[PDB]
């Protein structure tokens, strides 16, 4: 009776988003303790990238319209919140969009640099209807954690930003939903051992080999205040 320690044994990709990670082996109690202390951290705080500020030329606020587009500009701001990017080198980038001609404006038409990579290129942003009409915007992407609304950012700034720089609400977390299952492990003599199958579902801006390592680094950091300091 000493212990047995788990290990990251298997990772498979159902789709570009859906993944299923197993851990093996566990004892009796720890199969249902780690499986609930890894859902409560992977949903709350995981670092991702999100769109923060959109600046379309010719337009002052978000409650007007532009010529030759189907949606209002507020619908374009609602479309640009669901954009799954991945910034590797820097910590804040600015992307440009330019389009002219009849047809939709997909997310693949953004002139990206070498580091950022729009992972879902079939996204839909706008709809152009006239030949002479065009669109042009600059899009700021930051790195964050959790959910930061627009009122907090407009309250926690002091420099005068120019009229036209619209603000978007930022939801940073990549993980959409996550479940876990505990099945009887396949060990030949220690029969009552358990395994833990964490079933992750996200968008394409995270790696399931890295998310569990971040979510266990956080848990081994927060328990460091319990192991020595009383």
């Amino acid at each position: 009776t000493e212990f047995l320690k788990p290990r990251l044994v298997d990772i498979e990709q159902v789709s570009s988003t859906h993944a299923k990670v197993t851990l093996e082996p566990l004892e009796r109690g720890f199969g249902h303790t780690l499986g609930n202390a890894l859902r409560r951290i992977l949903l709350s705080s995981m670092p991702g990238c999100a769109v923060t500020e959109v600046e379309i030329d010719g337009v002052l606020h978000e409650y007007s319209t532009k010529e030759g587009v189907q949606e209002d500009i507020l619908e374009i701001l609602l479309n640009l919140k669901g954009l799954a990017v991945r910034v590797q080198g820097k910590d804040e980038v600015i992307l440009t969009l330019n389009k002219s001609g009849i047809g939709p404006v997909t997310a693949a038409d953004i002139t990206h640099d070498g580091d950022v990579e729009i992972v879902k290129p079939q996204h839909v942003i706008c709809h152009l209807t006239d030949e002479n009409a065009s669109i042009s915007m600059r899009i700021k992407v930051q790195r964050g954690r959790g959910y930061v609304p627009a009122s907090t950012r407009i309250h926690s700034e002091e420099d005068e930003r120019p009229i036209g720089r619209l603000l978007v609400d930022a939801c940073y977390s990549p993980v959409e939903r996550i479940a876990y299952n505990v099945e009887a492990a396949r060990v030949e003599q220690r029969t009552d051992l358990d395994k833990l199958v964490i079933e992750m579902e996200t968008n394409g801006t995270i790696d399931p080999e890295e998310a569990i390592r971040r979510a266990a680094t956080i848990l081994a950091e927060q328990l460091e205040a319990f192991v020595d300091l009383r």
Binding site: R39, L43, S44, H61, A179
Partner: protein, 50 residues
């Protein structure tokens, strides 16, 4: 007795807070009490929170 009149049109956007009256279609009223985190809501065995 009036020289000139200026009219200014604001545009307030309002989220939900603790206090905003919500109600169904069958006459069940209510006041929102707490905005939980996502991981505290009861979830079924497929992962979807309520």
């Amino acid at each position: 007795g009036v020289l000139k009149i200026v009219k200014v049109y604001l545009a307030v956007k309002r989220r939900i807070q603790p206090g905003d009256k919500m109600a169904g279609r069958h006459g069940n009223k209510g006041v929102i009490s707490k905005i939980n985190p996502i991981e505290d809501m009861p979830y079924d065995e497929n992962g979807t929170p309520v």
